[PDB]
């Protein structure tokens, strides 16, 4: 968790700096919260490896996601 | 008595739900498409 | 005393009667996995 | 618009007033999640507790009238100098022939053989087939479909 | 007075991302993304081609990225198709998941006294003790 | 298999069969058993096997473990109207308050 | 926006595009992290 | 003596996910961030011809 928060911190910090072409604190919390599928209206970026990132990161939020619920599940059981 | 195979690879005959009609769905709303441009005659 | 059944033609062989009740089978190996095409509920769920 | 939220699409719908409108949302965002839970517990709940059901009763006419239909690897086993061989070309042996090719004498070579596959399917006296299947090499299945 | 037998291996090594059968499924599947998301696009445009596969990649990954609303009401039909299907995906590796991680275990563990295993050995079957015992 | 709402528990400790009774000493005991023979050698006893008791009405113990076409959800189907009808009288309250502001 | 906040918590509560409250504080912003947790 | 356990019991906690698994999937955020940069130089290049 810890690990993939400095992740978060890591390309927030990508999405600052290779995009000096809105981040200060944006770019933490709405790229934070949808790993948890918010309601939370985000700043759309341009389309760019900004939107790119996003997806890769989203893939691992939607593996997080079942896998966590695939293990609490089954600890109710056995 | 016969309790359980294990698996966990995905079937990939199990696939006929996801090629189920999308296709032909799609080729109605192109004919819906034709009736469009049929009512733009009308 | 060996494990031997009759047909018709074993009138010449004179059986007591069948201790034990056997068959004609086949053998075959396993599978892996069963096709349950990803609809169970989908004709019971649309209903609803 | 309204429909894809019990998906929770991408989509950016039309944001309405801040009336009944919202509120219906949220009434119908309650059934969208309830039936998601619902769906997916029966979901991983049929993947567990299921039957898993051999043909073996079917292809006992069908591999029999047609055993080129699907597959010439169709290995087929024998009793070889064995009285069923005689029963059943009295009645049930027009498989009779392609097996000439499939005479193996010595029940453990035909064992081993289907054991690396190089038998299809093997014909025998049921009880030895049970007792050597409760035998077999740890936790193989090798029985007849329902016994 | 019992039996002293050994521990099996587990079934660890949960590096199964894609056991549940992706490595030809879902690039089957993806490539059939953009091929009907250019003719989706043809069938807005003879009432952003390279823009207008980012929403279906924005529905299918549940990530916001929206710019697409189709004009054409059959298009939005398809995308009624995509968000019914991408949710029968990640329903179903869901419970691929769960099954995986739980279903069985083979086991030959041994009853007792009462085992034909024991009292028919095999060849195999050192059951040995130690000598001068009243075993 | 045929009517419904019972089960067994396998264990069958008797092994037996169904033969069929005549006097000792009778002329009709080996011709008899021989047609016994060649009623099984044709299936004709599994023909009458098929033509009787090879009838299943009742499902088995299986346990589909569960399904869900429409009965127990209506429990939750009274969301969509509970609270509909109510407002109506919400529009009447908000039209009240901008009548007040 | 005081009975507007709630919506909100609401929208995020039920995974409902409902968005109007992004917080100038940043420490709403962290008890929407909580909230998205729990 | 006797009554000091040492090793876990048959019971079957059924799994743990902690930190090991992961790496399987823990390429994917470096997979193609370094690309991405000449992505840019493409992308500013497409930009310099349109």
């Given at each position: 968790?810890?690990?993939m928060?400095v992740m978060?911190?890591?390309?927030?910090?990508?999405?600052?700096?290779?995009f000096e072409?809105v981040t200060?604190?944006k770019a933490?919390?709405?790229?934070?919260?949808?790993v948890?599928?918010?309601?939370?209206?985000?700043?759309?970026?341009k389309?760019?490896?900004?939107?790119?990132?996003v997806?890769?990161?989203?893939?691992?939020?939607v593996?997080?996601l079942?896998?966590?619920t695939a293990?609490l599940?089954?600890?109710?059981?056995? | 008595?016969?309790?359980?195979?294990?698996?966990s690879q995905?079937?990939?005959?199990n696939?006929a739900?996801?090629?189920?009609?999308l296709?032909a769905?799609?080729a109605l709303?192109?004919?819906t498409?034709?009736?469009?441009?049929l009512?733009y005659?009308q | 005393?060996?494990?031997?059944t009759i047909?018709e033609?074993?009138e010449?062989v004179?059986?007591?009667?069948?201790?034990?009740?056997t068959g004609i089978?086949?053998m075959?190996?396993?599978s892996?996995?069963?096709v349950?095409?990803?609809?169970?509920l989908?004709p019971?769920?649309?209903?609803? | 618009?309204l429909?894809g939220?019990?998906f929770n699409?991408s989509?950016?719908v039309?944001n309405?007033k801040?009336?009944?409108?919202?509120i219906m949302?949220?009434?119908?965002?309650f059934?969208a999640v309830?039936?998601?839970?619902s769906?997916t517990?029966?979901?991983?709940?049929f993947?567990?507790?299921?039957?898993?059901?051999?043909?073996?009763?079917?292809?006992?006419?069908?591999?029999?009238?047609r055993?080129?239909?699907?597959?010439?690897?169709?290995?087929?086993?024998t009793?070889p100098?064995?009285?069923?061989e005689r029963?059943?070309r009295?009645?049930y042996?027009?498989?009779?022939?392609?097996?000439?090719?499939?005479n193996?004498?010595?029940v453990d070579?035909?064992?081993?053989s289907?054991?690396?596959?190089?038998?299809?399917?093997?014909?025998?006296?049921?009880?030895?087939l049970?007792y050597?299947?409760?035998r077999d090499?740890?936790?193989?299945?090798?029985?007849?479909?329902?016994? | 007075?019992?039996?002293?037998?050994?521990?099996?291996?587990?079934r660890s090594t949960?590096?199964?991302?894609?056991?549940?059968?992706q490595?030809?499924?879902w690039?089957?599947?993806?490539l059939?993304?953009?091929?009907?998301?250019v003719?989706?696009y043809?069938?807005d445009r003879?009432?952003?081609?390279?823009?207008?596969?980012?929403?279906?990649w924005?529905?299918?990954?549940?990530?916001?990225?929206?710019?697409?609303?189709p004009?054409?009401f059959?298009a939005?039909?398809?995308?009624?198709?995509?968000?019914?299907?991408?949710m029968?995906?990640?329903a179903?590796?869901?419970?691929?998941?769960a099954?995986?991680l739980?279903?069985?275990?083979?086991?030959?563990?041994?009853?007792?006294?009462?085992?034909?295993?024991?009292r028919?050995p095999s060849?195999?079957?050192?059951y040995?003790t130690?000598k001068?015992?009243?075993? | 298999?045929?009517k419904?709402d019972?089960?067994t528990?396998?264990?069958?400790?008797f092994?037996s069969?169904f033969?069929?009774?005549?006097?000792?000493?009778?002329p009709?005991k080996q011709?008899?058993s021989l047609?016994?023979?060649?009623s099984?050698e044709?299936?004709?006893?599994?023909?009458?096997?098929?033509?009787w008791?090879?009838?299943?009405?009742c499902?088995?113990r299986?346990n589909?473990?569960?399904?869900?076409?429409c009965?127990?959800?209506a429990?939750?189907?009274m969301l969509?109207?509970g609270?509909?009808?109510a407002?109506i009288?919400?529009?009447f309250?908000?039209?009240?308050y901008?009548?007040?502001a």
């Amino acid at each position: 968790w810890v690990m993939m928060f400095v992740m978060l911190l890591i390309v927030s910090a990508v999405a600052v700096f290779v995009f000096e072409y809105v981040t200060i604190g944006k770019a933490i919390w709405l790229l934070w919260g949808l790993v948890f599928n918010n309601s939370v209206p985000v700043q759309n970026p341009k389309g760019t490896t900004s939107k790119i990132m996003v997806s890769v990161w989203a893939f691992f939020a939607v593996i997080f996601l079942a896998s966590y619920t695939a293990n609490l599940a089954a600890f109710m059981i056995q | 008595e016969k309790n359980e195979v294990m698996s966990s690879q995905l079937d990939i005959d199990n696939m006929a739900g996801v090629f189920y009609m999308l296709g032909a769905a799609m080729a109605l709303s192109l004919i819906t498409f034709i009736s469009e441009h049929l009512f733009y005659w009308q | 005393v060996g494990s031997l059944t009759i047909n018709e033609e074993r009138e010449v062989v004179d059986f007591s009667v069948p201790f034990i009740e056997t068959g004609i089978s086949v053998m075959v190996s396993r599978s892996n996995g069963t096709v349950s095409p990803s609809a169970f509920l989908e004709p019971f769920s649309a209903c609803v | 618009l309204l429909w894809g939220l019990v998906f929770n699409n991408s989509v950016p719908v039309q944001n309405p007033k801040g009336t009944t409108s919202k509120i219906m949302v949220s009434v119908w965002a309650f059934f969208a999640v309830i039936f998601l839970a619902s769906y997916t517990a029966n979901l991983a709940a049929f993947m567990i507790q299921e039957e898993y059901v051999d043909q073996v009763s079917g292809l006992s006419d069908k591999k029999f009238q047609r055993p080129n239909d699907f597959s010439p690897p169709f290995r087929f086993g024998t009793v070889p100098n064995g009285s069923t061989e005689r029963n059943i070309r009295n009645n049930y042996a027009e498989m009779h022939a392609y097996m000439g090719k499939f005479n193996q004498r010595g029940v453990d070579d035909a064992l081993l053989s289907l054991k690396t596959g190089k038998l299809d399917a093997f014909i025998y006296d049921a009880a030895v087939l049970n007792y050597m299947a409760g035998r077999d090499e740890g936790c193989k299945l090798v029985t007849i479909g329902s016994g | 007075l019992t039996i002293l037998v050994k521990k099996e291996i587990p079934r660890s090594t949960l590096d199964s991302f894609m056991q549940p059968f992706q490595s030809t499924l879902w690039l089957l599947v993806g490539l059939s993304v953009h091929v009907v998301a250019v003719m989706l696009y043809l069938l807005d445009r003879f009432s952003t081609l390279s823009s207008a596969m980012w929403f279906s990649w924005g529905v299918l990954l549940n990530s916001g990225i929206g710019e697409g609303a189709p004009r054409s009401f059959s298009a939005r039909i398809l995308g009624m198709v995509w968000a019914g299907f991408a949710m029968i995906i990640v329903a179903s590796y869901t419970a691929n998941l769960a099954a995986f991680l739980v279903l069985d275990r083979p086991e030959e563990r041994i009853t007792g006294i009462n085992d034909p295993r024991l009292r028919n050995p095999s060849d195999k079957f050192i059951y040995a003790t130690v000598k001068q015992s009243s075993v | 298999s045929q009517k419904c709402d019972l089960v067994t528990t396998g264990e069958l400790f008797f092994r037996s069969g169904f033969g069929i009774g005549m006097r000792k000493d009778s002329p009709w005991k080996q011709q008899v058993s021989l047609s016994i023979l060649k009623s099984h050698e044709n299936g004709f006893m599994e023909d009458l096997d098929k033509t009787w008791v090879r009838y299943q009405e009742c499902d088995s113990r299986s346990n589909a473990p569960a399904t869900l076409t429409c009965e127990n959800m209506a429990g939750v189907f009274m969301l969509v109207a509970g609270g509909i009808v109510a407002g109506i009288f919400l529009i009447f309250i908000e039209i009240a308050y901008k009548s007040r502001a």
